[PDB]
Design a protein around this motif. Structure first.
Motif, short mmCIF file in Angstrom:
data_model
loop_
_atom_site.label_atom_id
_atom_site.label_comp_id
_atom_site.label_asym_id
_atom_site.label_seq_id
_atom_site.Cartn_x
_atom_site.Cartn_y
_atom_site.Cartn_z
N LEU A 19 -1.07 10.84 15.55
CA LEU A 19 -0.40 10.42 14.02
C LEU A 19 -1.37 10.18 13.04
O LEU A 19 -2.35 9.33 13.29
N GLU A 20 -1.24 10.75 12.06
CA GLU A 20 -2.44 10.72 11.01
C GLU A 20 -1.93 9.68 9.72
O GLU A 20 -1.21 10.24 8.83
N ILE A 21 -2.48 8.86 9.57
CA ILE A 21 -2.13 7.64 8.56
C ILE A 21 -3.26 7.92 7.28
O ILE A 21 -4.34 7.44 7.70
N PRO A 59 0.73 -1.16 0.10
CA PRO A 59 -0.01 -0.02 -0.09
C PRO A 59 1.00 1.23 0.16
O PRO A 59 2.07 1.26 0.44
N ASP A 60 0.11 2.36 -0.47
CA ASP A 60 0.98 3.62 -0.40
C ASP A 60 0.85 4.29 0.76
O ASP A 60 0.20 5.60 0.48
N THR A 61 1.08 3.95 1.84
CA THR A 61 0.67 4.63 3.21
C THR A 61 1.65 5.76 3.47
O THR A 61 2.76 5.46 3.42
N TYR A 62 1.27 6.70 3.88
CA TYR A 62 1.85 7.71 4.45
C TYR A 62 1.50 8.39 5.70
O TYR A 62 0.58 8.05 6.39
N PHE A 63 2.32 9.29 6.18
CA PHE A 63 1.91 10.19 7.37
C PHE A 63 1.69 11.40 7.36
O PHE A 63 2.38 12.23 6.71
N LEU A 72 7.94 -2.51 9.41
CA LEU A 72 8.78 -1.47 9.18
C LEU A 72 9.10 -0.93 10.66
O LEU A 72 8.21 -0.32 11.49
N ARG A 73 10.29 -0.81 10.88
CA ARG A 73 10.73 -0.16 12.29
C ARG A 73 10.98 1.39 11.70
O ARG A 73 12.24 1.84 11.08
N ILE A 74 10.08 2.17 12.01
CA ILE A 74 10.13 3.51 11.38
C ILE A 74 10.43 4.64 12.78
O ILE A 74 9.71 4.60 13.82
N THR A 75 11.34 5.32 12.69
CA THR A 75 11.39 6.32 13.63
C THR A 75 11.11 7.70 13.02
O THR A 75 11.78 8.44 12.24
N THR A 76 9.77 8.15 13.09
CA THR A 76 9.08 9.05 12.42
C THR A 76 9.23 10.42 13.27
O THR A 76 9.40 10.57 14.61
N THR A 77 9.01 11.53 12.87
CA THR A 77 8.83 12.83 13.42
C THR A 77 7.50 13.63 13.15
O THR A 77 7.49 14.15 11.95
N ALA A 81 11.95 15.61 -0.75
CA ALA A 81 10.78 14.88 -1.23
C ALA A 81 10.68 13.39 -0.38
O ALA A 81 11.57 12.70 -0.14
N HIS A 82 9.59 13.61 0.28
CA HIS A 82 9.08 12.87 1.08
C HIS A 82 9.08 11.21 0.60
O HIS A 82 8.59 10.88 -0.41
N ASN A 83 9.75 10.01 1.41
CA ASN A 83 9.85 8.95 0.91
C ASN A 83 9.31 7.81 1.97
O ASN A 83 10.02 6.70 2.24
N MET A 84 8.26 8.08 2.65
CA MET A 84 7.51 7.08 3.66
C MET A 84 6.05 6.95 3.25
O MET A 84 5.39 7.91 3.38
#
Ligand SMILES: *[C@@H]1O[C@H](CO)[C@@H](O[C@@H]2O[C@H](CO)[C@@H](O[C@@H]3O[C@H](CO[C@H]4O[C@H](CO)[C@@H](O)[C@H](O[C@H]5O[C@H](CO)[C@@H](O)[C@H](O)[C@@H]5O)[C@@H]4O)[C@@H](O)[C@H](O[C@H]4O[C@H](CO)[C@@H](O)[C@H](O)[C@@H]4O)[C@@H]3O)[C@H](O)[C@H]2NC(C)=O)[C@H](O)[C@H]1NC(C)=O
Ligand SMILES: CCCCCCCC(=O)OC[C@H](COP(=O)(O)O[C@@H]1[C@H](O)[C@H](O)[C@@H](OP(=O)(O)O)[C@H](OP(=O)(O)O)[C@H]1O)OC(=O)CCCCCCC
Ligand SMILES: CCCCCCCC(=O)OC[C@H](COP(=O)(O)O[C@@H]1[C@H](O)[C@H](O)[C@@H](OP(=O)(O)O)[C@H](OP(=O)(O)O)[C@H]1O)OC(=O)CCCCCCC
Ligand SMILES: CN1CCc2cc3c(cc2[C@H]1[C@@H]1OC(=O)c2c1ccc1c2OCO1)OCO3
Ligand SMILES: CN1CCc2cc3c(cc2[C@H]1[C@@H]1OC(=O)c2c1ccc1c2OCO1)OCO3
Lengths: 347, 336, 121, 330, 334, 347
Positions: free
Chosen positions: E145-147, E87-91, E121-126, F101-104
């Motif tokens: 956090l909005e997915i 899927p094309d999931t983002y934040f 996925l081990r994601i360290t997000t901001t 450019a975002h890549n997540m």
């Protein structure tokens, strides 16, 4: 003649090889033996509650698909072939931002012994995550963990080990302390199991044990506050008539404690409770407060405005609360120092 | 003059295997090192490291890459260095490093007709050196850079400094604002380890910290505040709000100097020489107010019970500058 | 004041579940544990769960027992399984931030009251 | 049509080779449109600069005969043509930009004329001689050459309009003032061989008018405030003592500022000299009151106020005369 | 054994298209999501965001990958994920995020016999927050956090929290140094736009700020300096230098506290609730030296043209006024 | 099976004979790229760097005649792998320092094809643009922060950028995308300009954002303590003329307080090297305090005695210049406040 056979072995390794799936995917659990050589236990940030460490991270696991026969027994591959062989996805459970170095070539070795047992010794830099209990600042000690396991594979698929006795496997270099604040006593190597949402994982563990040096805080933070409290109690041996002198003395000693308080609280992570240094500074601040309140109680009972002349109308005597507080305040401050330094040098 | 060179290059790369050491079954290849330093950017005492930007050049010969018929030294594009053998040399001190990529990735390949190849990277490293800072700021660190082959042992590769006395040039063209380079060295040796014997070179420096900032900034004001603590001895003993305010504002000034130098100097939480000095000066200004409290209790307190004020003042003018001079003598002989 | 209050049974021919409530402190960041002391004055390590959910086990008891925690209700839970008659001892709840830790009784600085479990055939 | 031209150009083209590799040195005409010089880091001795960097050269392996006469291309042709390995010699950080596309371009004309222009931000290095701070001028360079190619193989040349410059009012220059600009050419001798090294010097000097109203006016007024004690009677000793010592404390509070936006250079600047001589004057004022109080009251010092009221403003005015004239006019 | 498994993977990925949505013409694919939060690293009041480390996991049943004859779950190497559909999931809240890359890049592909595929996925997000710091430091924050799916609408893809209220784990493990998590909520909703309804999920928090630390650092010394301002009332009016040194050194100490709490605290340039308290205490300390100006001008100036009245009145008025100020403050904000 | 086969055949035969290097309308016409921005989170404007983070969706649309098709659908969804093999215009932001450019978790790019050929290219960007800010009127200022973007290699004669909607409705910020600590976003302003260069003439879309700094923080931190310190310096005049140490402590330590306020109002403030209005105000207030102690030195010259008025010989008159300073200094302070807050609030 030797290089021809060597290039033939290199060409005929990866024929029909599949790096997408585990060696013995239905046969056995894949035992991976692990060796760590810490070259530097780098600087430990208290504000971020993290530390930096540099390792050579040796692995070894037997792959039946990579037996060979030739002159030598041991191979030495490119990273072009080390990206074409299955390699266990060892991540770090408390990594914040970690770097596999590649100056100048990529820092990855891959040896193949002739029985098929690989040896993959890569060089890392780990910015880890050590949670700190700071009730006993700065006279404290705590453990900092370094915890690795496979990512995709469970206990039923990949099981980790150590290459030696477990306490001898993790080796810190002798010139590899590289700390100024803390003081590394020793490591403690262990092995464990998580329960994630996806299955049980074998999780290795190395703890690193750190005690903080306290001489910097005795010089910078403790002794000026002690001497300021000693001043605020000293003022009592001035006479009761010198109102502006003892007034300037009391309020500006409170200003000195204010400066020491704010400068000592500046160089410290903003935790949400009472560190031991905060207890000490707050109680010393209360002593310097009580000294000026005691001088106000002296000043309310004065009856006069002039000094006793050096040769002899009436005069003042030394007030009784002056003679009380001269015995009271240094005794209370000494009792508090005994309680403090006996309580907090024990933990 | 283009077709012949193109055919010789395409013949040299034809059938080449990048996974083969020069003289693979026989002798160790002698890779010759040559550093030219652009700059040292910073030396951080907190993270215990410096940052070195350099031109890093490797001489060796590979007889698969020998060409005849051309009197030139063929400088190729940097993209041919992905298609050659290049040594697995790393930096043992490396915290963080990168080859710069403007306006291309900074590499060179310069072939010679006998097979000698020069390979020059332009590297900004961050080497890690342990420091002892107990003589801060009167100290002299040294900091190194450890160059080592990764996988090849000394059976397979050898290292040497190209022009072994003057390989690393540009050292004395470096002007650090905070330090000074006394002298550098060039140690060529072989480590012996459990997996084998590896070759290792090591450029070392010896940094000396300049103290002209610290005398003007950190020592002379503390000396002058400590001298101003002593003006109360030339003030008559009847004036309470003169000597009390003088000694009190003086210990306040020493507190503000100590806290601001705790702020501006790099935060190194253990005992240094400047900490011992500032603590000693604070103790002097502290005793210079305890003296007045003792005088006031002798005169105005131990008066009516019925031990000389002028004697204590004269003896204090004898003792405190002499004690301060002995303290400065012990300090500036010990930490030099 | 930190109070580590225990619970659970103490006698069986089977299975057992021994809990250990806490109050006085949020022990989310603290390594809580179970110990064992037979008559013989030996504090043997049994199990420990870390803040990062890692189960560590004693060597003699590995794979038999199961430790779990409720991080919200601030408790540690040891599930007992397949009891020998030689599992007859006192079970000590413990908490700490183990320094030279996870196997040594001089790391844990908070203790349970200890519960006797007696098992015979 | 043009697709056929490009496929005919890429056929048989070796991009490992310099054009005219045994024939002649490849002459490169460079051009540079500076957008903005960023904030000059005085501590780390960097400065940010954002440029457009244009190169021309003739590649006779890219000749084509057609009607189009110009190939105004994307960044897609860049990785297949020989591009000169031009590095910036005093850069610490430099990035071509990659939003939204690669910010490169290529224009191939029919005789072989080739234009390559990429946008660059550069954290370039320059040494700041911080004598006469904060009244100092500088010339921070920006040097560049080929990396692997010597003088015999690549020669750079400026064009006639060498450095084109924007408005200077949109630039990120806080403290410094853009006063001058020049280009040059030298040839260095490095170990690998002689390299044709272009450069652009950026002449910068100060906007001084800040440290007047931060440090100079307060230090002078607090020296005058130290002098204020002289017009107060001798027998008010706590007032004179509080004047002297709190004036010293406020001098220390201003000597706090004296090395703010600087590296820790180990010599005396003009700011340090000024703050130091002001602190010495306030020190001398309080020691003067000490020598006036002991030598008269506690036992010609008996008239030493009438000497000091003329002696200290004369010495301070002469110090300002010598100081300001020497550090501005000389 | 192993050859059958290799042939099975090769014939599953024989002729696979990496651009087809699962059931491309039929129903929308259901993607069930799952987060194991490792830690929340920093909550920056200056930059108005937070750094969030997690294990972001997805489930969707893909009928182009259903095998048979093998009982075990196929857990492949992570480098098969470039050869599948994801899927094309983002934040939406994201500023800058990265899947970790040591020692290899943290993905997992765990296949299942019906075609279910786990994607970890081990994601360290901001993730950003809009912080209401008008009640600082007595605030309750709401950081989310909005997915959201990117290209597919809700006619093509559906997002649900796998497990309802117990999808997101590990929030109880989080021990923030200055905050304390009240509550996390889980929201699933389709968001109606003009271009098409997109799915959205919402991890969210609530961060009650812990307040005893500011009682230690910030409130207590201002209280004690304010009380030491009052000491001039119990001094005779003749002692001028004492009461003047009291009031002046007291406003100097309040100035130092205000400046070094301007420097120590996070720097957010608008009106807070610690600023109102410190400025109010500065106003009280200023009035307590205006009192001595009032006294000295009434006695020594307007003598020839009471003192114990003004002092005895101020000794009763200023403690009552300061206690009323504390009452209004610590009940208006709390 | 039918829809998948038709869709796969359309995708596999869409790239027949295509070149990415050539503009649609190469020698024929001008490519009409139509842009549209939705600004989600207009991030923190940095005063220390003359920059601002903007975090935008970016939609631009143009018609490619080479990539038309037939079939059941009108709308064709693409992978970014296939969209990398299609011409897209080289848009660059003219004043962007360093943008991402975002890549997540995928690359956040999109490319739809309408059946007539009008493309659609949306992507989530985050631009750290340059805003030229002038702090001549700190903090009573407005700023205009632009977004200038044009093509890089294609001129006005080859590409023209437009806006999709009417230009007032194209660049629409979120209602919940303020995210500014120290500004009010007072409406955006667009323009479609043309900017010349040396390598031809290019087409530039500007988009100014108009900002306005909030004032009340510097009122309660910087203006009010300076005003109250000046009033506290004026407090010294209403004493008697005999209390020399008291008025001395006033005049000196208020200069010390103004020095502390000047330091820790200017340090929390970006280092422009010219006279900001806050620095003007602090310097004039500091001049008032200095003038107060110069007034006291002038008073103390003319005293003649050391005793004040008794409760019951002769005494001192009240000084005339104390009687004139009470009229002089507060009136001058009010005049300077009226001049200041009437000048810099017309700006
Ligand atoms: C922090 O801040 C965030 C953001 O404000 C808070 O998150 C919000 O939490 C509340 C409470 O949980 C959410 O409201 C709920 O929404 C759910 C989901 O419904 C959605 O999907 C339905 C179909 O699946 C659809 O029917 C809903 O449509 C309704 O709402 C839209 C809104 O535009 C409206 O147009 C429609 O007409 C409908 O009215 C919607 O799309 C819903 O199930 C919940 O209903 C329950 O609770 C209510 C009482 O609250 C009760 O009356 C119902 O019977 C039912 O039990 C509820 O409406 C809200 O959506 C969240 N905000 C966002 C942006 O998602 C968060 O709570 C704050 N605090 C913390 C600690 O995080
Ligand atoms: C924080 C301290 C608070 C203390 C609150 C104390 C409140 C309180 O009531 O104090 C009373 C007294 C202080 O009185 P103090 O000594 O200050 O004052 C003397 C007192 O007034 C005598 O009565 C006077 O003599 P006389 O009558 O004319 O002959 C004498 O006159 P002179 O000699 O000048 O001519 C005065 O100096 O204290 C104690 O007795 C010990 C208490 C120990 C308390 C110990 C507390 C730790
Ligand atoms: C920055 C300010 C600079 C001011 C500079 C001012 C310099 C300047 O000129 O000072 C002299 C004088 C000060 O007068 P002031 O009232 O302070 O002093 C009286 C004066 O000295 C009389 O001469 C004394 O009389 P006598 O012989 O003992 O009988 C009298 O003694 P006593 O009766 O009390 O015992 C003194 O009190 O001022 C003016 O005349 C008006 C100036 C208006 C200045 C208006 C300023 C706003
Ligand atoms: C890169 N080389 C060879 C491979 C290797 C594999 C390793 C290792 C270090 C090394 C280094 C090299 O080999 C050493 O034995 C060694 C190495 C570097 C530095 C050392 C060493 O011992 C003490 O200090 O630590 C654990 O597994
Ligand atoms: C990623 N999605 C779908 C594609 C898209 C394309 C866009 C856009 C936002 C979006 C978002 C999504 O779609 C919207 O229409 C929209 C989206 C998110 C947030 C929004 C939106 O409108 C107002 O606020 O702004 C300009 O062009």
């Amino acid at each position: 003649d030797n290089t021809t056979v060597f290039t033939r072995i290199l060409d005929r390794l990866l024929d029909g090889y599949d790096n997408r799936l585990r060696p013995g995917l239905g046969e056995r659990v894949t035992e991976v033996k692990t060796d760590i050589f810490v070259t530097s236990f780098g600087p430990v940030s208290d504000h971020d509650m993290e530390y930096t460490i540099d390792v050579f991270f040796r692995q070894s696991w037997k792959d039946e698909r990579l037996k060979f026969k030739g002159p030598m027994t041991v191979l030495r591959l490119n990273n072009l072939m080390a990206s074409k062989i299955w390699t266990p996805d060892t991540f770090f459970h408390n990594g914040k931002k970690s770097v596999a170095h590649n100056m100048t070539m990529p820092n990855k070795l891959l040896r193949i012994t002739e029985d098929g047992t690989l040896l993959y010794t890569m060089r890392l830099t780990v910015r880890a995550e050590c949670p700190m209990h700071l009730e006993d600042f700065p006279m404290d000690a705590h453990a900092c963990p370094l915890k690795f396991g496979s990512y995709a594979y469970t206990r039923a698929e990949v099981v980790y080990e150590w290459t030696r006795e477990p306490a001898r496997s993790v080796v810190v270099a002798e010139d590899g302390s590289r700390l100024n604040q803390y003081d590394l006593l020793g490591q403690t190597v262990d092995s464990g199991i998580v329960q994630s949402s996806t299955g049980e994982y074998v999780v290795m563990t190395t703890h690193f044990h750190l005690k903080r040096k306290i001489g910097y805080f005795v010089i910078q933070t403790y002794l000026p506050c002690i001497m300021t409290v000693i001043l605020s109690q000293v003022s009592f041996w001035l006479n009761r008539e010198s109102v502006p002198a003892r007034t300037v003395f009391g309020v500006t000693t409170v200003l000195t404690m204010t400066t020491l308080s704010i400068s000592a609280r500046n160089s410290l992570p903003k935790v949400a409770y009472a560190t031991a240094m905060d207890w000490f500074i707050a109680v010393c601040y209360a002593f310097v407060f009580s000294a000026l309140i005691e001088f106000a109680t002296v000043n309310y009972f004065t009856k006069r405005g002039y000094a006793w002349d050096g040769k002899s109308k009436t005069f003042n005597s030394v007030s009784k609360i002056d003679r009380l507080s001269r015995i009271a305040f240094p005794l209370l401050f000494g009792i508090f120092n005994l309680v403090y330094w006996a309580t907090y040098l024990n933990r | 003059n283009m077709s012949f060179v193109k055919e010789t290059v395409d013949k040299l790369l034809k059938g080449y295997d990048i996974r083969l050491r020069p003289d693979f079954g026989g002798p160790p290849v002698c890779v010759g090192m040559n550093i030219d330093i652009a700059s040292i950017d910073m030396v951080s005492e907190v993270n215990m490291d410096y940052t070195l930007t350099m031109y890093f050049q490797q001489y060796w010969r590979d007889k698969r890459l020998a060409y005849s018929g051309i009197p030139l030294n063929l400088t190729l594009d940097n993209r041919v260095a992905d298609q050659l053998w290049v040594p697995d040399t790393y930096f043992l001190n490396d915290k963080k490093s990168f080859v710069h990529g403007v306006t291309v990735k900074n590499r060179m390949i310069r072939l010679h007709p006998d097979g000698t190849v020069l390979y020059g990277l332009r590297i900004t490293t961050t080497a890690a050196c342990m420091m002892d800072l107990r003589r801060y700021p009167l100290d002299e660190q040294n900091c190194t850079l450890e160059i080592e082959s990764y996988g090849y042992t000394t059976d397979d590769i050898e290292f040497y400094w190209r022009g072994g006395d003057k390989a690393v040039t540009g050292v004395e063209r470096i002007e650090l604002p905070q330090f000074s380079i006394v002298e550098h060295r060039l140690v060529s040796r072989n480590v012996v380890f459990a997996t084998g014997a590896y070759p290792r070179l090591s450029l070392s420096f010896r940094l000396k910290r300049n103290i002209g900032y610290f005398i003007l900034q950190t020592y002379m004001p503390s000396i002058l505040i400590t001298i101003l603590s002593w003006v109360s001895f030339w003030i008559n003993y009847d004036a309470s709000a003169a000597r009390v305010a003088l000694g009190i504002t003086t210990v306040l000034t020493m507190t503000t100097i100590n806290t601001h130098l705790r702020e501006t100097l790099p935060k190194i939480p253990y005992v240094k020489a400047i900490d011992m000095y500032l603590m000693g000066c604070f103790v002097f200004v502290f005793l210079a107010l305890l003296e007045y409290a003792f005088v006031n209790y002798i005169f105005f307190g131990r008066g009516p019970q019925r031990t000389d004020v002028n004697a204590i003042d004269r003896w204090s003018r004898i003792v405190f500058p002499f004690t301060f001079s002995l303290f400065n003598l012990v300090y500036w002989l010990y930490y030099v | 004041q930190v109070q580590l209050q225990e619970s659970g049974g103490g006698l069986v021919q089977g299975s057992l579940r021994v809990s250990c409530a806490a109050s006085g402190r949020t022990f989310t960041t603290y390594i809580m544990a179970w110990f064992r002391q037979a008559p013989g004055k030996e504090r043997e390590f049994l199990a420990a769960m870390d803040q990062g959910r890692i189960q560590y086990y004693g060597d003699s008891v590995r794979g038999r027992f199961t430790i779990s925690r409720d991080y919200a209700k601030n408790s540690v839970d040891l599930q007992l399984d397949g009891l020998r008659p030689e599992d007859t001892a006192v079970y000590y709840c413990a908490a700490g931030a183990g320094f030279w830790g996870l196997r040594t009784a001089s790391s844990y600085h908070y203790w349970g009251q200890g519960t006797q479990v007696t098992v015979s055939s | 049509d043009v697709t056929v031209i490009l496929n005919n150009l890429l056929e048989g083209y070796d991009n490992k080779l310099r054009p005219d590799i045994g024939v002649k040195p490849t002459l490169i005409h460079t051009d540079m449109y500076v957008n903005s010089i960023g904030p000059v880091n005085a501590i780390n001795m960097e400065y940010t600069i954002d440029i457009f960097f244009a190169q021309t050269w003739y590649d006779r392996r890219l000749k084509f005969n057609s009607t189009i006469k110009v190939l105004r291309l994307n960044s897609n042709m860049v990785g297949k043509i020989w591009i000169p390995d031009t590095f910036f010699r005093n850069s610490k950080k430099a990035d071509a930009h990659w939003i939204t596309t690669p910010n490169r371009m290529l224009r191939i004309w029919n005789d072989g004329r080739v234009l390559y222009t990429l946008r660059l931000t550069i954290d370039a290095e320059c040494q700041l001689q911080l004598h006469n701070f904060p009244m100092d001028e500088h010339s921070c360079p920006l040097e560049f050459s080929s990396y692997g190619y010597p003088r015999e193989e690549i020669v750079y040349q400026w064009k006639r309009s060498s450095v084109e410059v924007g408005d200077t009012r949109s630039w990120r220059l806080y403290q410094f003032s853009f006063v001058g600009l020049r280009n040059t050419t030298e040839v260095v001798k490095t170990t690998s061989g002689d390299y044709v090294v272009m450069s652009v010097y950026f002449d910068l000097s100060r906007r001084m008018g800040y440290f007047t109203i931060q440090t100079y006016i307060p230090c002078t007024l607090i020296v005058v405030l130290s002098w204020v004690s002289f017009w107060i009677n001798k027998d008010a000793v706590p007032a004179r003592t509080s004047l002297g010592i709190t004036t010293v404390l406020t001098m220390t509070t201003l000597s706090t500022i004296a090395r703010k936006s600087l590296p820790k250079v180990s010599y005396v600047t003009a700011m340090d000299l000024f703050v130091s001589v002001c602190f010495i004057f306030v020190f001398s004022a309080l020691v003067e009151y000490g020598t006036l109080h002991y030598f008269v009251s506690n036992r010609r010092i008996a008239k030493m106020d009438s000497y000091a009221r003329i002696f200290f403003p004369t010495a301070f005015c002469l110090f300002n005369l010598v100081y300001w004239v020497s550090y501005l006019y000389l």
